[PDB]
Amino acid sequence: PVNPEKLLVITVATAETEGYLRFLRSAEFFNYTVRTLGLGEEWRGGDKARTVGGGQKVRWLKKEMEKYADREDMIIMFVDSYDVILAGSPTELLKKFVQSGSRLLFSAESFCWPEWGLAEQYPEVGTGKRFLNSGGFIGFATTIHQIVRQWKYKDDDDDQLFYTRLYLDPGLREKLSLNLDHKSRIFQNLNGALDEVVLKFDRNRVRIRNVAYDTLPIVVHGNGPTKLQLNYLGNYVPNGWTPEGGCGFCNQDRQPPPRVFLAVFVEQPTPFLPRFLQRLLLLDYPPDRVTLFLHNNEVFHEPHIADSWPQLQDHFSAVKLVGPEEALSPGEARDMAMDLCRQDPECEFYFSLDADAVLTNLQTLRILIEENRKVIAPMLSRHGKLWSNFWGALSPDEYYARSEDYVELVQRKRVGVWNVPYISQAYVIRGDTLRMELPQRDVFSGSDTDPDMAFCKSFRDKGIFLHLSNQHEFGRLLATSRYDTEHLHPDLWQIFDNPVDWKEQYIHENYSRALEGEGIVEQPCPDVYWFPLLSEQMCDELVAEMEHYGQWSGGRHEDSRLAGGYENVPTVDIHMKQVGYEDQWLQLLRTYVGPMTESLFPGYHTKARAVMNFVVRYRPDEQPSLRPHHDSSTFTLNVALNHKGLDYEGGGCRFLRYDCVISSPRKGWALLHPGRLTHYHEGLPTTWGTRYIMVSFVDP
Amino acid sequence: PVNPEKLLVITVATAETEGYLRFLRSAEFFNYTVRTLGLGEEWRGGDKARTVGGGQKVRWLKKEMEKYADREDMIIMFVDSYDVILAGSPTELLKKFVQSGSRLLFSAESFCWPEWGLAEQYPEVGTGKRFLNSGGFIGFATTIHQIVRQWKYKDDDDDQLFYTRLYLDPGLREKLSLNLDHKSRIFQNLNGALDEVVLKFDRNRVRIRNVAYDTLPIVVHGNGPTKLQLNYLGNYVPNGWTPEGGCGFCNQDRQPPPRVFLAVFVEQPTPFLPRFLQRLLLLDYPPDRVTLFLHNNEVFHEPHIADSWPQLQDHFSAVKLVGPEEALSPGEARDMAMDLCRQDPECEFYFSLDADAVLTNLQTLRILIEENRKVIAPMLSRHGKLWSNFWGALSPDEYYARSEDYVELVQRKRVGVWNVPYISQAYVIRGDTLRMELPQRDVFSGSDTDPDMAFCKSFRDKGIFLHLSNQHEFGRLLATSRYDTEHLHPDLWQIFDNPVDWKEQYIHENYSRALEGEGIVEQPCPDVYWFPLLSEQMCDELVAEMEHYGQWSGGRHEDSRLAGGYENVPTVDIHMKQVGYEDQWLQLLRTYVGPMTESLFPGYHTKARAVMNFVVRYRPDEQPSLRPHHDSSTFTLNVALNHKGLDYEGGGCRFLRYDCVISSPRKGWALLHPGRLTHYHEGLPTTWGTRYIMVSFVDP
Ligand SMILES: *[C@@H]1O[C@H](CO)[C@@H](O[C@@H]2O[C@H](CO)[C@@H](O)[C@H](O)[C@H]2NC(C)=O)[C@H](O)[C@H]1NC(C)=O
Ligand SMILES: *[C@@H]1O[C@H](CO)[C@@H](O[C@@H]2O[C@H](CO)[C@@H](O)[C@H](O)[C@H]2NC(C)=O)[C@H](O)[C@H]1NC(C)=O
Ligand SMILES: O=c1ccn([C@@H]2O[C@H](COP(=O)(O)OP(=O)(O)O)[C@@H](O)[C@H]2O)c(=O)[nH]1
Ligand SMILES: O=c1ccn([C@@H]2O[C@H](COP(=O)(O)OP(=O)(O)O)[C@@H](O)[C@H]2O)c(=O)[nH]1
Ligand SMILES: *[C@@H]1O[C@H](CO)[C@@H](O)[C@H](O)[C@H]1NC(C)=O
Ligand SMILES: *[C@@H]1O[C@H](CO)[C@@H](O)[C@H](O)[C@H]1NC(C)=O
Ligand SMILES: O=C(O)CCC(=O)C(=O)O
Ligand SMILES: O=C(O)CCC(=O)C(=O)O
Ligand SMILES: [Fe+2]
Ligand SMILES: [Fe+2]
Ligand SMILES: [Fe+2]
Ligand SMILES: [Fe+2]
Ligand SMILES: [Mn+2]
Ligand SMILES: [Mn+2]
């Protein structure tokens, strides 16, 4: 039973990169003893991601092994550190080594790298990996010393060719009892084996299983082009995220805060921008510590920015606008904003936020800064859909791909802080990282590749992790896909594409409370109910849209009213059809009036059909009143669109059979009365100003 | 200026017939002096209506004239009396005689009667009547004496041939200055001149005008076959009926009363007979003075008569039934009933009343008896139509014809007591007239002619007037034309043909009062109105008709109710369509429910459309309740058809949104509530007995 106190892990690492630190945490979880060679030095092993190299690893190890040249009592395992995580204990590792009968076991690989023509020389293996991989091997210290002694080559020569050449010596391979871990009992190299590796869960720990060989490896090596697959596994293995404990490295549970450069990007016509700009004033972070940069690409949004700009300038420490007349492409804009932060040593954190990100959590900035990562994004999704501001995986093209755990994360079945290949629309970046690790200006620009992808790739190429937190509800993403800008108030037409935001801007703030009892709804006259439905902004924009159409009814015009004997009872009005708002208004009816009606009239059901939908204008100079009549409806909805007193005098609705009068309508509130038989009614004369109302004859 | 004290009217009359008395009244109106020859004697002048005759007139006149043979100071006018009325004064008559230059003026006639071959011998006249008529002549007494002296012939020879022969003597005609009144200045004979005579009205007097000659005759002679035309004129001329005075011989203003034989005739299936038989008990005339005879030709009416017969037998002095098993034809039945009166000297008046006569005036018998005529009928019309129980005129066929004043009489623009050619369905006849003047048994029978016509003709042939009074509202005539007897209660289906009577039997007696305010209508729940609509008899017959169909609803049956989510809400019921009563029930709705609805819901109009009309049966053993639902109607009508307590326990209607319960329905009363949106409602469980209701979903 070999003693774990005699096992030493040796690894190489010239800097404490996020991968190195991920490795160490996995080593410390199992209580391994880790010696790290090279930590302050310059890497001379060549660009291992483009070419061969790594001989410097062998030189440093050879020098370290001279201490242990005679230590037959010591087992040593050498592993890479930037792309390796440990998944099993020293005890299990040692038992498995001993079972191999080997004196120095190398990991095995599907590819014969870097000289593919050496494959013939290798021994035959039935089903396991055939070839040697230098990223991981374990053996007696005396045997390892005898191998690494023979290093006498350049720092930029290939370490794995060196070991392969020695392994392919039949006399040497037998003298020293050298072996390869063909069936991945100990070492799992991913390159060429992705289809064989799955996560194996436990209550408080995760590891990996090779389903081809039915093994539980100890060492997971994301060798070659599998770093992102290793990134994926390292979110779980060994104690990343677990069924019972959750995430293991996040906070879980949440005097001057760091100065922040906040950069906002308006790169396409985007709905509800006035609302977004107003949210900036509400972000819970001291505004004297925030510098605002706003890039607007859209002349459509210039009035919006202008209205908001005085309040922003008074709010934040400093503000800078870059408008459309500057002709910047989105890539150049984002380079410029990031570089303003990079070049200012007082910029401790850089926070990029696009205009289609709705931050519902006003503490997002604090939360992300406290997470203490180089780069981190809050998870934002489109309402009720899977689409989000991150990708879990990449295609070989390096385009979008759905990771095996994407849906669980978007649905927040698994919450934590995830290492992912792509983030967008909102993220926070350390100022130090921009200065020390990505000093180039051309981060988003440079190739014909999309800027958002180029940015992520820029960070991946430096080995910087991209973190994504779904630990909290942070907000959502607006649909901007087909946003029709040819209206006086385009956001009035957003009831389909952005219904959550549409409701919050146009439905009365006390509507939902009214629909749940609470004694808001009123019944001023028998079977006439009165409730808040439309927000003041909705009334104002709707009136303005009607006046902008300008073509009100006149003589010869006919409505669906019933008075006396086949009389015609018209109003000066505009029907929703004429302005192109029928479909939107029916959606309102379906969603907000239908349910209100069934609640106030128990027993009644409706799908809210209405062929007659129109806005009425009363004035002393044209048609000031509406004579007694019935409506061609099962029930009628009558919504006040302006203020009695401020905008008009007189007016109001009278119900003759009940000698009951609605003398003082409320802007945004609706009347709901039966349309036939019982509620013969009259619109009293408007005596001054202009009185606007919205009328729907539903279920005719 | 000849003195009217020297003018004597001589006429012949063997009896004081109604025509003679009509003549005398017209003579007394103008203050003529009338000598009447022959009053107690036997007429030997032959049948003047079949043949020639009348010589007896000349014999009596010749004897009377011997007194005046030398009285050159006297003017004498001889006229017939049974078919003559005077229309002008003695003064006007005398002036006109004098203007003629004649010493003995005869009336003229279009026909050369009785020897047509004497026409050549007459003098030529341009346009006036050419030939002599003996019914009227005026002249100096000495001249008349010289003419009548020459009478030496049989009582049955023709008087007019005698005068013609003397007139056609050229020497005589010139010696005595004999003349004919060619242009009807004085005498108007109607035969051959009907087209020339019209009535000329004045405030308090009527006369006739000859429009061919533009004259105003003094003497109107209905000679030959024009007696009925004279009958017509004599209703006005000279003071019969006048614009300002009205009728001149009627009462205008209305201790043992005469014994009466009342005879009732049921000669065809007739509607509402139970009601008619019940009316007999209400006739305002002492029942101990009335003998009832009832002839029923219809087995359909045997149960009706049987139900009523105990009350009739207890009511009247004596009663006799003659049923269908006696095989009597209507003619034999009416002969038999009239002859029972004829042969009983205690039968002072005979009153014949058919079963389709509705006497609304319970004093009809008194009124007609007080009118003191031989034969008189009260005017009865079919509701809102011109058809009545009399004819004003006869065709040459002696069939129906419309008199020039028929419509004015039916519409009661002219009221009085009229001499008319035909009466039917109700009339009163003096017992004496039957004994003394129509002793034959075969009054209605004898020829293949209709009995009703034969009866009138029988009386006309004896010169008996047929009187018709429209001086009062007496009643109406039922339509019996197409009476469908193939029902359990045929009168339920009479809403079209006899709507006045249908209303009085089936509509609630307090319906009309309720429709005119008076605080009968109730509103037991908000916008649920409650009013009396159906009579108890209507409910009882309607239920019984449904149970007699017997085929009530069951499983798989679907109604037009709306509950929850596309649930099916059935009732065990029968729809009006199935029993063949839809059209009738819609008529009820149109006529009685429509107007009630518009009165209780001011502003609403309806033509009372209803596709769903049905009777519901609730029982503990089948379907006792009706779960909460809405109706496919603008408003719903809900009529109770039996008695809570007597016939069922439990039941009632509940309106959930109003926490209001109709716990105690009223048989025959209707509920009226809106059908949609507001009045979600439930039929409570019937716990004992059977609860029937009538339901209509109107305006769906
Ligand atoms: C929604 O409901 C709230 C609470 O019922 C309303 O609040 C009040 O507003 C009045 C006048 O604006 C104030 O005098 C009260 O002090 C407020 N009460 C509270 C608890 O805030 C609010 O006005 C309603 N909103 C709308 C648009 O009608
Ligand atoms: C129609 O209305 C009359 C009067 O309102 C009702 O008459 C009364 O009936 C009750 C019970 O039958 C008696 O106690 C009263 O004395 C009656 N009053 C009078 C003035 O007659 C009559 O019942 C109503 N008819 C129906 C069928 O409901
Ligand atoms: O600048 C560098 C590059 C690499 N390494 C170490 O050398 C190993 C070899 O690099 P890599 O794992 O990327 O090569 P591959 O396994 O993909 O062939 C890394 O894991 C680190 O342990 C290092 O210390 N500094
Ligand atoms: O039974 C009779 C029939 C006739 N007359 C008288 O004789 C007249 C002649 O009869 P009528 O007028 O019917 O004959 P016509 O004028 O039609 O030829 C009558 O008007 C009566 O004045 C009479 O007294 N008794
Ligand atoms: C690691 O060592 C500590 C004692 O030094 C011990 O308490 C802990 O449980 C060990 N953990 C594992 C996973 O072996
Ligand atoms: C008839 O005579 C009386 C007097 O005897 C007279 O009062 C009356 O007015 C006269 N009527 C007519 C119509 O001549
Ligand atoms: O002006 C009002 O409030 C009543 C008008 C009405 O109900 C209608 O549009 O038909
Ligand atoms: O039984 C009742 O009174 C209620 C039933 C009803 O209204 C219906 O027939 O639809
Ligand atoms: Fe309109
Ligand atoms: Fe209306
Ligand atoms: Fe039914
Ligand atoms: Fe119902
Ligand atoms: Mn590696
Ligand atoms: Mn005559």
Coordinates of C-alpha atoms and ligand atoms in Angstrom, one line a residue, chain A residues 508-510 513 520 532 669, ligand 1:
Chain A
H508 CA -51.4 51.2 -15.4
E509 CA -49.0 50.6 -12.5
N510 CA -52.0 49.7 -10.3
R513 CA -53.1 45.1 -7.9
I520 CA -59.2 49.2 -6.1
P532 CA -57.1 51.5 -13.8
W669 CA -59.1 54.3 -16.1
Ligands
LIG1 C1 -51.2 53.3 -7.1 O1 -51.6 53.0 -5.7 C2 -50.9 53.8 -4.7 C3 -51.3 53.3 -3.4 O2 -52.7 53.0 -3.3 C4 -51.2 55.3 -4.9 O3 -50.5 56.1 -4.0 C5 -50.8 57.3 -3.4 O4 -50.9 58.5 -4.2 C6 -51.5 59.6 -3.5 C7 -51.6 60.7 -4.6 O5 -50.7 60.4 -5.7 C8 -50.7 60.0 -2.3 O6 -51.4 61.0 -1.6 C9 -50.6 58.8 -1.4 O7 -49.7 59.1 -0.3 C10 -50.0 57.6 -2.1 N1 -49.9 56.4 -1.2 C11 -48.9 55.5 -1.3 C12 -49.1 54.4 -0.3 O8 -48.0 55.7 -2.0 C13 -50.7 55.7 -6.3 O9 -51.0 57.1 -6.5 C14 -51.4 54.9 -7.4 N2 -50.9 55.2 -8.7 C15 -51.7 55.7 -9.7 C16 -51.0 56.0 -11.0 O10 -52.9 55.9 -9.6

